[PDB]
RNA sequence: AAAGCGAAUGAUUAGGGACUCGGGGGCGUUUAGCCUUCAUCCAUUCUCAAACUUUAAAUAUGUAAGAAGCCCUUGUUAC
RNA sequence: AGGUGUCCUAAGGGGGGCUCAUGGAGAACAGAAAUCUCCAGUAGAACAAAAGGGUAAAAGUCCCCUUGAUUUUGAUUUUCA
RNA sequence: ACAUACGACCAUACCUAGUGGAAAACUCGGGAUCCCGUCCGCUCUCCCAUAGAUAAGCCACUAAGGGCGGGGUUAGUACUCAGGUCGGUGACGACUGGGGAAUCCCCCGUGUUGUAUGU
């Protein structure tokens, strides 16, 4: 048996059905800054700057920006500890991450909520709550007569 | 006991048999209780019980 | 004689015994592996910023 | 010859079909799956009966061939050589190996011994389509042929028309509506989604 | 009515497949050069030609194509030998046609034993104006189904323009 | 007999190419390298002087690439040389040079660097590139753009390089060599410059006019009928193009109005809508299906 | 995992519709004469894959949920 | 089920023009297969070598020019302590 | 709204067949001195914008079109996580607390949009 660099990447590194050929150029048109959070997804058509198969499907933080690639910090679990790994990835294997979009939209929503609450004199709720049990309510059967169901007898269908 | 139910029971503070706790029903707590269902009996207390 | 070849049976429990240590993050990360041109410029940018901050207390008054 | 079928009754591994990795596989014992008047039209044989597995097990090609021979002989002698159509619907694609006894368990991967059909609960093993007057003959033929199989099998009279996937009533109404055309020993159905002229010339009675 | 659908001769490609390289192939190239007024080109062998003991990459044929009035007159001289008589098999379903002469000396060329005697194959490719749509580099595209030539149309054009007979 | 290749399975598994590539308009291999900016330069725009040729026009654009589509910084056309005096040969090398100069001046005026970076005022065939300019703030590097030839071939003496030379003389720094200008001799690796000046001022067209008038007067009249009608002589082409360059530099925003009918945007929208054919509805298609069924049945 | 093969690759059971011939063999010979037996093609059909797949779960897995944050203004640099 | 101890001045680097396997029609010798022409042709070809990915104005093929198969020392990735 | 150039998504855009197309644009088009390249000005390159035509490209519409896309149905089915001193000789199955597919089949649709210059 073998332990080469791209062992077991038959499907992960492959391009999807009817997804071959030309690479969209918005990938190259994107810009990245140090501290940005990016998702790593290996493009099989770009053999330069390929990250190892472990980092495929991982999310990290950009720590270095270069001509055609970014340095990403990932944390890899080995034995009983976490190791900080730094990988140089070409842009084609890097996608900006929505892993923080909810928080980044909540921070500004909370800012406007705070200023509006201060203006209006009544505090509002800034922190999200988990789904709560449903409240009491009344269901009218007017024009919604219940339909009585019974278990069906067994019969063969072949 | 498997480690995930063990951790959930530790977080619910049910570390010993015949231990009991009050829990406010939310989605977050209900999912944990559902996971540790094979180890707990739970229900809706009345004023006398409380 | 023959024996067992390999096993990962107890490794997860051994790892979790004292926790999985994740190195704590710091406010200022190391500039190791950063683009050397950027590092060379950043050195002098920091030099000038410190000089301007000292002149601000000494009379520059920005 | 071969090991008793007890040794290969239960599917304890992944399928092992004959292929470019598995060469040297002997031919299956069963080679004929259709018997009787297999050229008969759909309307000729409305009644259908299935011998169906009730277990998840492996059926040998030798057992399939023996059951086919028994059922075919009974049907030919009683319902006539032109009064039925019998289809064996289990195909032995899985290759079972033997480690013929360097020595001991060293290098124990075996050479191909034979072929076997993996069947599920509710999987149809044999089907017979015939006239409604041959119901008892078909039932008895299937019951006799089931003695050649391991495990439990059930004889179920299909509610469909022959080998078509349509019940008797819906098949009859679809045929009356001109929506069914006769192919060789089978039928084709109008779809109302093709070229209009082609559909009209293929199903003329459906547009009257 | 046909505004811009008049059939024109796109080109006339004529070739001699000698089957072997050497002096005879060079002489075939020479006769083709003096016929066309242009230097021809040689065709390699793509596979193991057991017919004449060839394996690969050996000159076995020479050919040249002509366009315009020179092509028209050369093809007319070829159908002089063929007596304007062609079989219906000679017309392709696309709209082109062709024919072979067993010896070239019955054309407007004087016999010379130094170069020998060669037959050759003429093939006329027809077109309508606007075929550049399928051959230009930028915005290359197909031609419409109604604008392509039909075997019957080519036969009729041949009959009308050359007064020829098709059997 | 004949296995049908283009069946339902073939259609289902067919992967279409990019729409622009199917249209045969964009070379995405070249585009990637043309528009991709170094990541450590962030949002610094990469400016493309894109040049395209139609049967009757020359299109020159200063373009930047954004994530959701390109942005036209400035555009110049061979249409607009009529406002500066050129009325014939709008797709020749002289017109290409003139429209490149017009686009260069337009871009410099738009971005406020026209007083500086004048380029060369009097063109010549010398191979030069716009250098940095001195000012009260010190040295300032010229505005930079790179040529985008599309699918056109970059052979020696091409009008794409004509437009590039025009813009370079206008004052935009375009990195380029000289081994593709007309008059460059590949065998000696030298630029004549005088052939280049001739091509810049359209002298090749004038010499063609003279040769045609001397040899074949009928073909000369047929080819240059509009030149005869406007009594534009071969010798006047050089001064006409020089005056066009002077006027282009004097007023890069001169407005040209064409002879085509002119309406408002709303008027054009209404007129175009008048000729728009509407799609059939589902019920209309169903009714047509029933009508066709009945007609075909009545036929047989 | 499941699912699929009137979807690619590969395996596989049966008949139909025609082709004109595509191979062979004939009947009343350059007669596209009239037949036949296969082959091809076509729209259907029974059954499959650890080293097949258009699809595609459950379990499990990466990241985030602020003060080292957010907003405004303007200082440094040799990039 | 298989592969490796090699092989390549190009089968490395850059640029450009072209589009392959195959099928259907056609053209003297010429036919099942030699060359020529057109039309279809999602890659069913090719890319040194196993297999799997990847590639169509290319990563294939032909042509032109070359030696980034160069100098210096670090950083990082996999196997991993 | 229509056209062109440069695009974004990359078939709702592809493929086949038929019909129609104001204005302008685009196109086919004409010539081969010069620049340039071919066996051949076929392609590429240059020159003309006169003439001819929307025949083709292009655009639009049509087709119980193939394909594609969306939805339903398949189906709470297949499958699967956790549970029992559950059933069954077994193969395997049912139940409890959860998650939950994919064909065939049916219905609908056949591009959206940015910048700039124009009609
Ligand atoms: Mg030992
Ligand atoms: Mg040991
Ligand atoms: Mg300790
Ligand atoms: Mg025994
Ligand atoms: Mg290029
Ligand atoms: Mg499976
Ligand atoms: Mg299949
Ligand atoms: Mg298959
Ligand atoms: Mg599998
Ligand atoms: Mg998932
Ligand atoms: Mg998750
Ligand atoms: Mg081995
Ligand atoms: Mg290579
Ligand atoms: Mg090379
Ligand atoms: Mg190369
Ligand atoms: Mg190339
Ligand atoms: Mg491939
Ligand atoms: Mg050099």
PDB file of C-alpha atoms (C1' of nucleotides) in Angstrom, chain D residues 10 55-56 121 192-196 199 207, chain I residues 63-66 90-93 106-108:
ATOM      1  CA  UNK D  10     -25.301 -15.666   3.234  1.00  0.00           C
ATOM      2  CA  UNK D  55     -35.067 -13.981   2.645  1.00  0.00           C
ATOM      3  CA  UNK D  56     -31.837 -12.087   2.019  1.00  0.00           C
ATOM      4  CA  UNK D 121     -36.749  -9.936   0.701  1.00  0.00           C
ATOM      5  CA  UNK D 192     -48.218  12.996 -25.002  1.00  0.00           C
ATOM      6  CA  UNK D 193     -44.814  14.707 -24.759  1.00  0.00           C
ATOM      7  CA  UNK D 194     -43.138  13.950 -28.101  1.00  0.00           C
ATOM      8  CA  UNK D 195     -43.455  15.212 -31.637  1.00  0.00           C
ATOM      9  CA  UNK D 196     -47.173  15.545 -32.322  1.00  0.00           C
ATOM     10  CA  UNK D 199     -47.202  10.420 -31.805  1.00  0.00           C
ATOM     11  CA  UNK D 207     -56.659  10.754 -31.218  1.00  0.00           C
TER      12      UNK D 207
ATOM     13  C1'   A I  63     -42.242  22.914 -32.374  1.00  0.00           C
ATOM     14  C1'   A I  64     -48.016  18.246 -27.622  1.00  0.00           C
ATOM     15  C1'   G I  65     -39.140  18.889 -30.638  1.00  0.00           C
ATOM     16  C1'   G I  66     -34.258  16.197 -27.978  1.00  0.00           C
ATOM     17  C1'   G I  90     -31.216 -18.460  11.656  1.00  0.00           C
ATOM     18  C1'   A I  91     -31.374 -15.055   7.556  1.00  0.00           C
ATOM     19  C1'   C I  92     -33.372 -11.133   9.222  1.00  0.00           C
ATOM     20  C1'   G I  93     -37.573  -8.275  11.111  1.00  0.00           C
ATOM     21  C1'   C I 106     -46.348  14.288 -14.157  1.00  0.00           C
ATOM     22  C1'   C I 107     -46.362  19.806 -14.667  1.00  0.00           C
ATOM     23  C1'   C I 108     -44.159  24.373 -15.854  1.00  0.00           C
TER      24        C I 108
END
